Design a protein around this ligand. Sequence first.
Ligand SMILES: CC(C)C(=O)N1C[C@H](NC(=O)[C@@H]2C[C@@H](O)CN2)C[C@@H]1C(=O)NCc1ccc(C#CC#CC2CC2)cc1
Ligand SMILES: [Zn+2]
Length: 299
Amino acid sequence: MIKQRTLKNIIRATGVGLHSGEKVYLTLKPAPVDTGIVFSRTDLDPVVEIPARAENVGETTMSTTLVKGDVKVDTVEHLLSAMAGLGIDNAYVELSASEVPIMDGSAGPFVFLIQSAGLQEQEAAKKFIRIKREVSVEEGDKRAVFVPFDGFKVSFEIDFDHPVFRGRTQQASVDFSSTSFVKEVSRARTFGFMRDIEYLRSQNLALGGSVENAIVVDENRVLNEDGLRYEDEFVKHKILDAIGDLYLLGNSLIGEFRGFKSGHALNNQLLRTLIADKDAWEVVTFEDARTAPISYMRP
Ligand SMILES: CC(C)C(=O)N1C[C@H](NC(=O)[C@@H]2C[C@@H](O)CN2)C[C@@H]1C(=O)NCc1ccc(C#CC#CC2CC2)cc1
Ligand SMILES: [Zn+2]
């Protein structure tokens, strides 16, 4: 064997920052073995690169933000989700502004741009982090857990007290060795309540938000004319966000993630607690893909 992968070709995209409302030009570039995912702010002289690693995560309530000095990259979770879902080890991500473009609110556009360019196997073993021990963090009624598991699996439960959610599935569990990230998860869009959006605009947040890139919910119903892509899109989006945050570990996981009302802050607590507890994980490679607990789509 299981080899590292980068992109076969450069991918360019244009979009708006969900939070900033800024137009942003995005370029995904191939990268050498053991680069990881590195974000670059090309609008600054000199360019600032922030490796997409747990240690570089800014103190952030809405999205996952990387920081170095007073430079930031906002809303990395959907793109990193896309890269995690296709098993991209190495890539440079160029941005003309502080925020990754939101596209349609899901990882769908990213997965497509990436799979249009195609992938490149590289002459070097893919390193994996295998969960050896259970690791859990709680705070109030939120819980985030890692469980040893021979594969990669994400379960999540949310519980909003809202007519839309109450009469919709708020639990989901997806084993990615037997279920398509691409088909079952990647198209799941971010969501916001009409009441919060009014306030957030007031504070110059959500300035790029529209029905074009978010599920907009009022008191009772989804306002998006065309409705939901999945009956359980909300909890599916939460799994997509978690897979993005998990990728800040800097290697693909062999294990299970369970989220109970968890978010970016607790996800990040769990990553830090996992990194710090070296008894709970090991790094492993696989000389024989045929026998390994995880598999990849052809390049
Ligand atoms: C309910 C909240 C607290 C919650 O727990 N969330 C969990 C999920 N998190 C996410 O998806 C994270 C956070 C986002 O960054 C992207 N990945 C969604 C939701 C969230 O954080 N959503 C922020 C938000 C999204 C869209 C809009 C929008 C607009 C629009 C308009 C114009 C017509 C009026 C506003 C806010
Ligand atoms: Zn999200």
